[PDB]
CSV table of C-alpha atoms and ligand atoms in Angstrom, one decimal:
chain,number,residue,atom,x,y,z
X,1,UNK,CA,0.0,0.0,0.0
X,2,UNK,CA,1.3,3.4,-1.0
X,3,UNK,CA,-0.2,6.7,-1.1
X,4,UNK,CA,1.1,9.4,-2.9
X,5,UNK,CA,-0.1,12.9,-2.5
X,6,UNK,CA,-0.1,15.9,-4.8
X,7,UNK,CA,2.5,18.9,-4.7
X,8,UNK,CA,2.7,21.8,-2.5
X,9,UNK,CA,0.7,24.9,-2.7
X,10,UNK,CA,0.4,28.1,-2.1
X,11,UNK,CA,-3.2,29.5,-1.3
X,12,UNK,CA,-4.8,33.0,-0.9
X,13,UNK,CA,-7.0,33.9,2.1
X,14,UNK,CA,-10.4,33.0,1.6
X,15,UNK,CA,-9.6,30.6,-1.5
X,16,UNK,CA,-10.4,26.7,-1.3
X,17,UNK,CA,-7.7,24.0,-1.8
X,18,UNK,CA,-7.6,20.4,-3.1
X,19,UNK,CA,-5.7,17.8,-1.8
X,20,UNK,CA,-5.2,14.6,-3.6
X,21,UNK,CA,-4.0,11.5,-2.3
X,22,UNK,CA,-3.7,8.0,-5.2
X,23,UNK,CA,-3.6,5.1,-3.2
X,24,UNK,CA,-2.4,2.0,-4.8
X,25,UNK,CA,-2.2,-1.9,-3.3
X,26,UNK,CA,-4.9,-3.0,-0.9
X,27,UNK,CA,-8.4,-2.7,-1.5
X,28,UNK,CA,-9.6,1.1,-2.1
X,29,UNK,CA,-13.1,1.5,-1.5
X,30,UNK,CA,-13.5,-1.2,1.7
X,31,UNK,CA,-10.8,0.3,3.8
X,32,UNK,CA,-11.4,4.2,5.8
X,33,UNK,CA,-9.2,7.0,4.2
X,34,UNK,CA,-8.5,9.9,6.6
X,35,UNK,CA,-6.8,13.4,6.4
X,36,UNK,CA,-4.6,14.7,9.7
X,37,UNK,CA,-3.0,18.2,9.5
X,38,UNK,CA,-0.3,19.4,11.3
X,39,UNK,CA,0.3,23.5,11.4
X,40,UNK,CA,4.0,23.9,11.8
X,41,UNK,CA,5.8,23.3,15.2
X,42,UNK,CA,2.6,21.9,16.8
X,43,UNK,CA,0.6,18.3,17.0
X,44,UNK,CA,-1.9,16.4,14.4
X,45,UNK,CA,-5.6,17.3,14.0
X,46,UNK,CA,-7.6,14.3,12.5
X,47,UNK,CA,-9.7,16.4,10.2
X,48,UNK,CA,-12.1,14.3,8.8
X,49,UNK,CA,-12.4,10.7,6.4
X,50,UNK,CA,-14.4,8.8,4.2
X,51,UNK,CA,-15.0,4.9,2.6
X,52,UNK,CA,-15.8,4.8,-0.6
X,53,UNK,CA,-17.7,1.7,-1.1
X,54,UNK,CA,-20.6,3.2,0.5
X,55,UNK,CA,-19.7,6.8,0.1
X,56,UNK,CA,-19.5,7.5,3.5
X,57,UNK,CA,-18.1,10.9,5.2
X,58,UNK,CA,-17.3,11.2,8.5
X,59,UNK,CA,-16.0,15.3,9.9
X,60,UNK,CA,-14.5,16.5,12.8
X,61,UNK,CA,-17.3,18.8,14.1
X,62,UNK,CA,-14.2,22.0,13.9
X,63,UNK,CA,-14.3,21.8,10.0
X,64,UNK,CA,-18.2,20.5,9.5
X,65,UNK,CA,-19.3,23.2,6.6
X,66,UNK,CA,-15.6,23.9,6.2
X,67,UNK,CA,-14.2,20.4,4.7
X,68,UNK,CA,-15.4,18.2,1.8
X,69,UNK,CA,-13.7,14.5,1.7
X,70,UNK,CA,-14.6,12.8,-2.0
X,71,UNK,CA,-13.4,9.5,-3.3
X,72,UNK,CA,-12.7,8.4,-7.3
X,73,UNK,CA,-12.4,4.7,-7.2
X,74,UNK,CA,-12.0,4.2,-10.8
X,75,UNK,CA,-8.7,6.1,-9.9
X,76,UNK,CA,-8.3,5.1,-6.1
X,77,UNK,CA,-8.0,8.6,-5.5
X,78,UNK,CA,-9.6,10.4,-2.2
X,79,UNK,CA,-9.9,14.1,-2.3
X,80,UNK,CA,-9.4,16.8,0.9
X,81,UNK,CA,-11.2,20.0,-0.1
X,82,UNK,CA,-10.9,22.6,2.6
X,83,UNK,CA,-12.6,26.3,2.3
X,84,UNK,CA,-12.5,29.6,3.7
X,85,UNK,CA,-8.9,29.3,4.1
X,86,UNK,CA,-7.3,31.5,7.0
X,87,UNK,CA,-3.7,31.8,7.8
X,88,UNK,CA,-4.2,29.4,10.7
X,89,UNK,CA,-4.8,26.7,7.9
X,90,UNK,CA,-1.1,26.5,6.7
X,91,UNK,CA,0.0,23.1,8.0
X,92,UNK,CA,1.4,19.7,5.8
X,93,UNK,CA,-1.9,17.8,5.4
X,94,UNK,CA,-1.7,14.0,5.4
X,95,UNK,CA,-4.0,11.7,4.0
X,96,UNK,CA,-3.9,8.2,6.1
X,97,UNK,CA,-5.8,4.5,5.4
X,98,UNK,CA,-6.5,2.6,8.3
X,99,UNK,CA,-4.3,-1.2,8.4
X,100,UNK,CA,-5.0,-4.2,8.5
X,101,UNK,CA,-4.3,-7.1,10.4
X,102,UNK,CA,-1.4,-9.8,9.6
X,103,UNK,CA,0.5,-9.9,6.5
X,104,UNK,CA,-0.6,-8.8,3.3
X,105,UNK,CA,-3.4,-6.1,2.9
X,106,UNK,CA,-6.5,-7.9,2.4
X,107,UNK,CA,-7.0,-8.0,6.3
X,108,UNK,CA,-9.6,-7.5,8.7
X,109,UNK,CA,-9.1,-3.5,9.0
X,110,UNK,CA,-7.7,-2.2,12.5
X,111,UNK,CA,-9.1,1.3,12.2
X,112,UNK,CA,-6.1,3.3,13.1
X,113,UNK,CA,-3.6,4.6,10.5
X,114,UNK,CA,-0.9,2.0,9.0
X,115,UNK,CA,-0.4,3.4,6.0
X,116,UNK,CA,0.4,7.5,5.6
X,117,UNK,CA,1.4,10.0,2.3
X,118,UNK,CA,3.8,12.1,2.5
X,119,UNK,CA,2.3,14.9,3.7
X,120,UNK,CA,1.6,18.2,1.4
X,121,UNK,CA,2.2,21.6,2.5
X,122,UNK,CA,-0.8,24.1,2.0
X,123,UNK,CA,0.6,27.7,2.8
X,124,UNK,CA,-2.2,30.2,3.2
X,125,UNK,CA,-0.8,34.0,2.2
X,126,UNK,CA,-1.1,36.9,0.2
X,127,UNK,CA,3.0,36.8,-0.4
X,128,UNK,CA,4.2,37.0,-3.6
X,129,UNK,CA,7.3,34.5,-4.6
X,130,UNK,CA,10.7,36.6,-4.0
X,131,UNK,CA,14.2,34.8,-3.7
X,132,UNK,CA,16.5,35.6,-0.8
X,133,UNK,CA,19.1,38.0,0.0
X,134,UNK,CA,22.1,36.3,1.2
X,135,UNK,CA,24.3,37.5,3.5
X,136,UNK,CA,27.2,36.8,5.0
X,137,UNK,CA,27.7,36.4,9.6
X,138,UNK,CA,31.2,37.2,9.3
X,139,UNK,CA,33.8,35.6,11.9
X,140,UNK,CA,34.7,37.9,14.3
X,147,UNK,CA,39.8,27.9,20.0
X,148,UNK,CA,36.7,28.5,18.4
X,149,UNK,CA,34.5,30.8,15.6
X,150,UNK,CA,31.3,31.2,14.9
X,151,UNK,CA,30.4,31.9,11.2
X,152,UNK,CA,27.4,31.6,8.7
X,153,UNK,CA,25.1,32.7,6.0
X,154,UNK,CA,21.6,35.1,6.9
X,155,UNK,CA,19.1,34.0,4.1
X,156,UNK,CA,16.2,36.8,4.3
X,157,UNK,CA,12.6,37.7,2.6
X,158,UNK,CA,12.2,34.8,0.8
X,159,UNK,CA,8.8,33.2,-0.6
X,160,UNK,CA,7.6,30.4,-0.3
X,161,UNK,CA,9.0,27.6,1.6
X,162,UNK,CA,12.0,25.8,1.1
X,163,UNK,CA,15.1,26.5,1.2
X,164,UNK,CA,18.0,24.6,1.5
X,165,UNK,CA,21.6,25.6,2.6
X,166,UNK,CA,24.5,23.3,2.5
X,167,UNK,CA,28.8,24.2,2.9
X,168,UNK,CA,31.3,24.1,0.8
X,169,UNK,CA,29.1,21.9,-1.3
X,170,UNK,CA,28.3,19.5,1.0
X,171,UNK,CA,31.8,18.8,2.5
X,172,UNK,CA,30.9,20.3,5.9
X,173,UNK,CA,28.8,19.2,8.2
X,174,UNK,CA,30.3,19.2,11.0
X,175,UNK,CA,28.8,21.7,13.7
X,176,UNK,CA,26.8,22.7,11.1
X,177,UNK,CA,23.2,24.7,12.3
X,178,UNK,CA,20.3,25.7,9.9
X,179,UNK,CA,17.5,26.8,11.3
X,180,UNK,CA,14.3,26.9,11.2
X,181,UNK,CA,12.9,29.7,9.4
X,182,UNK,CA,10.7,32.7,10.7
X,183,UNK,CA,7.7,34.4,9.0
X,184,UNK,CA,8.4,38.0,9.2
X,185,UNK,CA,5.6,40.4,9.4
X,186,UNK,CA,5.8,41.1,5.7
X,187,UNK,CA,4.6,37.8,5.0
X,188,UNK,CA,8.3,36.3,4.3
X,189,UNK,CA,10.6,34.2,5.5
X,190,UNK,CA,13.9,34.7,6.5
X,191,UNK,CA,16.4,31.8,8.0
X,192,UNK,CA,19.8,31.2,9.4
X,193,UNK,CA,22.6,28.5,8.7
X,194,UNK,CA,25.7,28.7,10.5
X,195,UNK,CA,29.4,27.0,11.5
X,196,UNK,CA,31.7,26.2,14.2
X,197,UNK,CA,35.3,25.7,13.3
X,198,UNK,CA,39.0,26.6,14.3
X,199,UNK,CA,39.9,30.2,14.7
X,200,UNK,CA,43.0,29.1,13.5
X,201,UNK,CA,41.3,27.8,10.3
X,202,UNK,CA,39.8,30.8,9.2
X,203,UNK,CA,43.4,32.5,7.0
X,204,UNK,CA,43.6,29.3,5.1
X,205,UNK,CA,40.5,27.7,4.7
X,206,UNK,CA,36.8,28.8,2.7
X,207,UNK,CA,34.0,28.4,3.9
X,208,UNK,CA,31.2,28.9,1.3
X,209,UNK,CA,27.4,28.4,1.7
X,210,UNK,CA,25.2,27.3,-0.9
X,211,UNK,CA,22.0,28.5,-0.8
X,212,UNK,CA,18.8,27.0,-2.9
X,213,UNK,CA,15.6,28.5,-3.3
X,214,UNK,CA,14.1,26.5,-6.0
X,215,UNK,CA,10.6,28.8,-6.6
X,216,UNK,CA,12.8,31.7,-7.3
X,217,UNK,CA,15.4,29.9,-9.1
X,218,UNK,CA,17.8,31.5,-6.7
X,219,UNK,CA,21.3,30.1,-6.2
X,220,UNK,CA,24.1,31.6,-4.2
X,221,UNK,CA,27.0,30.3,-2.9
X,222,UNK,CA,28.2,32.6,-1.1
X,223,UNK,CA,32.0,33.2,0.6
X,224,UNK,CA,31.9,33.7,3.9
X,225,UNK,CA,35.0,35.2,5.1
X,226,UNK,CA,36.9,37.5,8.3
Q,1,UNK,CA,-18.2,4.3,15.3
Q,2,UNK,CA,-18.0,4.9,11.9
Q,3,UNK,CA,-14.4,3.7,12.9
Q,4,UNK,CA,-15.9,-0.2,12.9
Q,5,UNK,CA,-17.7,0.2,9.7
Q,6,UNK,CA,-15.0,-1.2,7.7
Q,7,UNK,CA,-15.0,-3.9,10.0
Q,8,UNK,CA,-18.7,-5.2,9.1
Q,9,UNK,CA,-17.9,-4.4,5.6
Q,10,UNK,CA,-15.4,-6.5,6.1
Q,11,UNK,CA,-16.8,-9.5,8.0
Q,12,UNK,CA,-20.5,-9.5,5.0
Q,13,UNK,CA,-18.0,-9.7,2.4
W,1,UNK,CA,-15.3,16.1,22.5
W,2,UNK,CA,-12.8,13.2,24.1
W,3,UNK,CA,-9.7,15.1,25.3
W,4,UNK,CA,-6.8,13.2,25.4
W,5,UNK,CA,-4.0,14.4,28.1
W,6,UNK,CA,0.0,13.4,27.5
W,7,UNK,CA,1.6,14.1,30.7
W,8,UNK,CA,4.4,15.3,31.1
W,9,UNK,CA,5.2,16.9,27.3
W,10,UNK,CA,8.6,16.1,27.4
W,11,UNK,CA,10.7,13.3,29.0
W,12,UNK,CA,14.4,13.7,29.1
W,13,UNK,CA,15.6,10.2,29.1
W,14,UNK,CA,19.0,8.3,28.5
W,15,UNK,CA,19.4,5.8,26.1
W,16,UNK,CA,19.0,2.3,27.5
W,17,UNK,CA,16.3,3.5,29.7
W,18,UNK,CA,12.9,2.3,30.1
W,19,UNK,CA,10.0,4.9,29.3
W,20,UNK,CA,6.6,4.7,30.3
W,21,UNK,CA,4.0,7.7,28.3
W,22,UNK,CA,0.7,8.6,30.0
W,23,UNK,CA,-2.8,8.8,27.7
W,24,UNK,CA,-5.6,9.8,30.0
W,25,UNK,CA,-8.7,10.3,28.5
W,26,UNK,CA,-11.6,12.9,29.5
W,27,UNK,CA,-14.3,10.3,28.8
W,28,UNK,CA,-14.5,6.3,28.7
W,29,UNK,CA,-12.7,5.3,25.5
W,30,UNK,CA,-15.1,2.8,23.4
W,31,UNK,CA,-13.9,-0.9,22.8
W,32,UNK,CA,-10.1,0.8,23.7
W,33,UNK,CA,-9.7,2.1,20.4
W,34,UNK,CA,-6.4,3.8,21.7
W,35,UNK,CA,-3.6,3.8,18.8
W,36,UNK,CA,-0.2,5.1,19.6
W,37,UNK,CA,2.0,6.9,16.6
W,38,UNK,CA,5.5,7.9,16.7
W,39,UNK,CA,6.9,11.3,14.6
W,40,UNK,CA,10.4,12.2,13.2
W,41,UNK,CA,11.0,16.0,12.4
W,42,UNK,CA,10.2,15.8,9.0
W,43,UNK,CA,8.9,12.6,8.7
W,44,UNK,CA,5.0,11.2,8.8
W,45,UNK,CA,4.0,9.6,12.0
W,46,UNK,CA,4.0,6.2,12.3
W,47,UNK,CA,1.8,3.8,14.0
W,48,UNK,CA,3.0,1.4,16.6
W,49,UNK,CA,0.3,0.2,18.9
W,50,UNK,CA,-3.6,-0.2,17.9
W,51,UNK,CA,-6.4,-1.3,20.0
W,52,UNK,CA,-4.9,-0.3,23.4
W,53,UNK,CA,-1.9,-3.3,23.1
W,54,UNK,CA,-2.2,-4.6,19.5
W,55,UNK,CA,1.5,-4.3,17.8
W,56,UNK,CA,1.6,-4.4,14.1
W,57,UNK,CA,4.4,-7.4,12.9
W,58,UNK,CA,7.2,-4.8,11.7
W,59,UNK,CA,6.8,-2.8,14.8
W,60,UNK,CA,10.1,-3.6,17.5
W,61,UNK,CA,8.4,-5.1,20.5
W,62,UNK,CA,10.1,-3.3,22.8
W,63,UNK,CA,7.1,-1.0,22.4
W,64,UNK,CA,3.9,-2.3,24.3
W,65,UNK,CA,0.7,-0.5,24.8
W,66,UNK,CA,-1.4,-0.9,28.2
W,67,UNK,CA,-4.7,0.1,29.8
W,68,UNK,CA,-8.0,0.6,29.4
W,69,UNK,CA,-11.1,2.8,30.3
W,70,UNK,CA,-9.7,6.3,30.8
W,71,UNK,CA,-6.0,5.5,31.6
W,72,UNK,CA,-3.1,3.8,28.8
W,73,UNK,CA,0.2,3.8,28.8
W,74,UNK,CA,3.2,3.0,26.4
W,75,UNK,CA,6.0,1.6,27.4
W,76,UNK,CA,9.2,1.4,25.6
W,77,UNK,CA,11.4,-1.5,27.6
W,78,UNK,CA,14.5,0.2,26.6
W,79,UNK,CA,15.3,3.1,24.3
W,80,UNK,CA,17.4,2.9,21.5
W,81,UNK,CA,19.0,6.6,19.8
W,82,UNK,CA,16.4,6.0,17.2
W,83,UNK,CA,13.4,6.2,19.8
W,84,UNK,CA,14.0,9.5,20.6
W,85,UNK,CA,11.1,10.9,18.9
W,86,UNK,CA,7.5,12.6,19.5
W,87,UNK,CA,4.8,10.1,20.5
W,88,UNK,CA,1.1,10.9,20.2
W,89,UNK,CA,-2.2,8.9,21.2
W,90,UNK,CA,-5.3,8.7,19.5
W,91,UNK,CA,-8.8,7.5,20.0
W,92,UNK,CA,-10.8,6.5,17.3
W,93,UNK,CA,-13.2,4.8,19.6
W,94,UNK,CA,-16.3,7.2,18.8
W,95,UNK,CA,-16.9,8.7,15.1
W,96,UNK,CA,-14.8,11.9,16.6
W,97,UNK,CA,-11.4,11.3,16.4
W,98,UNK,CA,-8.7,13.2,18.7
W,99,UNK,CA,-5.1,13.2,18.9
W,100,UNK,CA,-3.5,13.9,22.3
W,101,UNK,CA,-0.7,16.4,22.1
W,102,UNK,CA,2.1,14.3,22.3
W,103,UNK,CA,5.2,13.8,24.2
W,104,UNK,CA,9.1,14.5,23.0
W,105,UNK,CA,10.9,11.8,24.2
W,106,UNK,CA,14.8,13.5,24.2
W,107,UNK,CA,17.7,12.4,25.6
W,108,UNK,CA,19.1,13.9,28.9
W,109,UNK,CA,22.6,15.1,29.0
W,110,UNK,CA,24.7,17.5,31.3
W,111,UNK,CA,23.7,20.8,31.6
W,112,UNK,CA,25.8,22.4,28.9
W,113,UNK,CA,25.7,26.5,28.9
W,114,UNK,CA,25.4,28.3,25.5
W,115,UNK,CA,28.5,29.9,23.8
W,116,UNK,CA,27.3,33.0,22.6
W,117,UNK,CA,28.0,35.1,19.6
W,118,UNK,CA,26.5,38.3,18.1
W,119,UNK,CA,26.8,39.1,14.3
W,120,UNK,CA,26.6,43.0,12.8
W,121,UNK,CA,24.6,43.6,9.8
W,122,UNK,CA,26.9,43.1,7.0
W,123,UNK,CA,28.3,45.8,4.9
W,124,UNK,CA,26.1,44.4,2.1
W,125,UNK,CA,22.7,44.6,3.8
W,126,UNK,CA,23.1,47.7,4.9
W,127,UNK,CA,23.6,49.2,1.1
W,128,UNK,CA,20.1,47.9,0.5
W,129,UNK,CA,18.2,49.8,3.6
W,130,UNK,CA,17.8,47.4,6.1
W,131,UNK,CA,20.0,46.1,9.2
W,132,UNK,CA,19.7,42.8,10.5
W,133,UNK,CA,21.9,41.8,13.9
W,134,UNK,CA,21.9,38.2,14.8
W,135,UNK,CA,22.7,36.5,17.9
W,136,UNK,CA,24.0,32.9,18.3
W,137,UNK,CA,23.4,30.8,21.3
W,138,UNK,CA,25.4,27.7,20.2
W,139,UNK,CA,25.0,23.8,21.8
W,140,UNK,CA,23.8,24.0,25.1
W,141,UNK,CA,21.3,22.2,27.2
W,142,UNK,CA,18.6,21.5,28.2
W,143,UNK,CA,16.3,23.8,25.8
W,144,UNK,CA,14.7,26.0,27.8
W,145,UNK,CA,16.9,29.8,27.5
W,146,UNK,CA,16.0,33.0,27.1
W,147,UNK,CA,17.4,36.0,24.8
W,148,UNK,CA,16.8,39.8,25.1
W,149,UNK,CA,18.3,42.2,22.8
W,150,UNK,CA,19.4,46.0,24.4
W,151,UNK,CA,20.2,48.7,21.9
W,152,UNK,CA,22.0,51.4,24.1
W,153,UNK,CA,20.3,49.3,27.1
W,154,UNK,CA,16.5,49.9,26.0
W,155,UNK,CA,15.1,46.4,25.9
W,156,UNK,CA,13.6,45.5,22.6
W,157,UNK,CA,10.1,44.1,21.5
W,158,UNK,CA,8.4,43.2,18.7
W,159,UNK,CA,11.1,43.3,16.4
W,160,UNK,CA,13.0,40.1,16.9
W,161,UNK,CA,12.2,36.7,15.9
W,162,UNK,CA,13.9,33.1,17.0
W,163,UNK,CA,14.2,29.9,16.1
W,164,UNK,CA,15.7,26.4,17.9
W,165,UNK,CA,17.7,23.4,16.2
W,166,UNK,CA,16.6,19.6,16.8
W,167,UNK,CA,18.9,17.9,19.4
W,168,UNK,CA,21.7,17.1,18.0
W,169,UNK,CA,22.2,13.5,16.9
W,170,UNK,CA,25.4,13.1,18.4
W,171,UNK,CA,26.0,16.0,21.8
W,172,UNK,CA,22.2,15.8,22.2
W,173,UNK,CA,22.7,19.7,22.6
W,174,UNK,CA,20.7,22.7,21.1
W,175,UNK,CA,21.6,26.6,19.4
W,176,UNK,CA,19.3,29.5,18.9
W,177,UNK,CA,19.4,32.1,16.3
W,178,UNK,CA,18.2,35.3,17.0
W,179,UNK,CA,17.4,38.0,14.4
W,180,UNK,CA,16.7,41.8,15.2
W,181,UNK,CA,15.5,44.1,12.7
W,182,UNK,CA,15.5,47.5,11.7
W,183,UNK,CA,15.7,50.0,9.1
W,184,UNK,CA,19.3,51.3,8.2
W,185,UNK,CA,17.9,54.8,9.3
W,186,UNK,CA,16.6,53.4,13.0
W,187,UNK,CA,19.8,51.2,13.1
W,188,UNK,CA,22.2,54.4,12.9
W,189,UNK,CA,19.9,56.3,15.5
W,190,UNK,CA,21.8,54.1,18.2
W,191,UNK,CA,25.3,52.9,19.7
W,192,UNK,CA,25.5,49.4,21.4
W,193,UNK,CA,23.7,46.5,20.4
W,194,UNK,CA,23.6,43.6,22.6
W,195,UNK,CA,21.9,40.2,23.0
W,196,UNK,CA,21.7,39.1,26.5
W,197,UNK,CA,21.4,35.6,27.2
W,198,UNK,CA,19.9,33.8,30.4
W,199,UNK,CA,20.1,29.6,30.7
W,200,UNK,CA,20.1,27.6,33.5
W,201,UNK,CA,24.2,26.6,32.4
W,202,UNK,CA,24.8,30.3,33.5
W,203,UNK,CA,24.9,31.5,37.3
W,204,UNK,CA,24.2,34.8,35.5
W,205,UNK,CA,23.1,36.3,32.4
W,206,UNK,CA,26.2,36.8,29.6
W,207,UNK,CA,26.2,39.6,27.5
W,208,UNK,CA,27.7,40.2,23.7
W,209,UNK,CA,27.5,43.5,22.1
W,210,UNK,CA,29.3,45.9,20.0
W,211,UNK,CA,29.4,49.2,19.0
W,212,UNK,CA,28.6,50.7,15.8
A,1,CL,CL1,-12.4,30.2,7.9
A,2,CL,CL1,9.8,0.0,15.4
């Protein structure tokens, strides 16, 4: 049993998104599909499911007139459609199908969730998508150096050094959502004061929305 | 429980 | 409404130890519908109990589940560096499904007090308008610290933001980045900027700053 859900998205305020999730082994429409959210930092919300054999829907009251669960079996596909959107709604949305007992996946069904996607980010905002400034945290036994990636949109970035070669006492952080609306993050590196004359320490910086790329020098 | 449907759905078929 | 109460949030916890996680439910929970999942940072969850004490086959049985009614426990016999994890309950025993809120399971280490270090807006940044000042509190324990930033010793709000590292795989430590931000014109209004930090590692708070 795999289920595979669609790609992130960005969403205004007050728009509706759909979530797909294609399941494939198992039986589709005799086993209970359910969507749990999780808003970032904080815990999972089971938000509602369905079985599609007998069309059945089943809401947490918090989202009854909100939430629409829908499932395709000739595609095995279930559907999340959430309205109204609010910041408050941004959170990676999982769709999950109950298990089933023993070996195989043509058990008697356990009701909890074996079997989980992996997880699609909604982001509810009115930002635009920009690509980072990058700026260098200059060095002043030990330094402390690194790389201030600020007002990007949307989420991800990623941040390596020197290409991947260090990773040692490496740090990237989470990022923060600024009150514009953007994000900003930090990625930084212990090493030897004594280091810092003959070695570089460069990070690369990845924002795939805005195509933005930087590998930037870091130095004292 | 709509949790147990599956369960009888199961078990009729 | 079934609330679903993990107590205590965290547990700090060394490897090899036994652990023992607390569900206790507001109401009776029907038939003991009580599943246990377990959540990597960026991962899914995963389940590992069902029914109160039912363990699916590729699930290490040194995770049992326990209890009935009102009151369920899992208990791992002895953690391995992998358990280290978040661990949530959930009861599907009535059409209304509820998640507790879940418990960190981290590992306990010596207290470990932060080295501290403040950056200055780069040269570039400030070209463009803006002047960012960061503040690194780097691989301390446990998590809990605080960070206030003075600019010529007025204390700062609202224009700061912070963020926290997972432990770390292998010191089982944490760092903090701070970020204040101003406009280039409010930035050169002022002389000293400095991040004060407060931990329990520290018998009082330390101090970086500079001058511009
Ligand atoms: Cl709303
Ligand atoms: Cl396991």
């Amino acid at each position: 049993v795999q289920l595979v859900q669609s790609g992130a998205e960005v969403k205004r305020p007050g728009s509706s998104v759909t979530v797909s999730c294609k399941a494939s082994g198992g039986s589709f429409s005799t086993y209970a599909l359910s969507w749990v959210r999780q808003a970032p930092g904080r815990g999972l919300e089971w938000m509602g499911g369905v079985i599609p054999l007998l069309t059945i829907t089943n809401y947490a009251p918090r989202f009854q007139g909100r939430i629409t669960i829908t499932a395709d079996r000739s595609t095995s596909t279930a559907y999340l459609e959430l309205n109204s959107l609010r910041p408050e709604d941004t959170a990676v949305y999982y769709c999950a199908r109950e298990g089933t007992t023993g070996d195989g996946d043509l058990g008697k069904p356990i009701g909890a969730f074996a079997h989980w996607g992996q997880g699609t980010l909604v982001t509810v905002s009115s930002a635009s998508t920009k690509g980072p400034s990058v700026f260098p945290l200059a060095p002043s036994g030990t330094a402390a150096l690194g790389c201030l990636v600020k007002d990007y949109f949307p989420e991800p970035v990623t941040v390596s050094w020197n290409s991947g070669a260090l990773t040692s006492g490496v740090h990237t952080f989470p990022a923060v959502l600024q009150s514009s609306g953007l994000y900003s993050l930090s990625s930084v590196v212990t090493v030897p004061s004594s280091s810092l004359g003959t070695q570089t320490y460069i990070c690369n910086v990845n924002h795939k929305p805005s195509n933005t790329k930087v590998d930037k020098k870091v130095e004292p | 429980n709509w949790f147990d449907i599956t369960n009888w759905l199961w078990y009729i078929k | 409404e079934i609330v679903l109460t993990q107590s205590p949030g965290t547990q700090s916890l060394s490897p090899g130890e036994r652990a023992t996680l607390s569900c206790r439910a507001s109401q009776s929970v029907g038939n003991n519908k009580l599943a246990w999942y377990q959540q990597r940072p960026g991962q899914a969850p995963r389940l590992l109990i069902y029914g109160a004490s039912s363990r699916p086959s590729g699930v290490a049985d040194r995770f049992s589940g326990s209890g009935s009614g009102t009151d369920f426990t899992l208990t791992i016999s002895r953690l391995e560096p992998e358990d280290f994890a978040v661990y949530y309950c959930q009861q599907y025993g009535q059409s209304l499904s509820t998640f507790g809120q879940g418990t960190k399971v981290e590992v306990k280490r010596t207290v470990a007090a932060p080295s501290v270090f403040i950056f200055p807006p780069s040269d570039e940044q400030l070209k463009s308008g803006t002047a960012s000042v960061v503040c690194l509190l780097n691989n301390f324990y446990p998590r809990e610290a605080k960070v206030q930033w003075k600019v010529d010793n007025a204390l700062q709000s609202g224009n700061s933001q912070e963020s926290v590292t997972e432990q770390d795989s292998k010191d089982s430590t944490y760092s903090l980045s701070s970020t204040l931000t101003l406009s280039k014109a409010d930035y050169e209004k002022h002389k000293v900027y400095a991040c004060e930090v407060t931990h329990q590692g520290l018998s009082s708070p330390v101090t970086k700053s500079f001058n511009r």
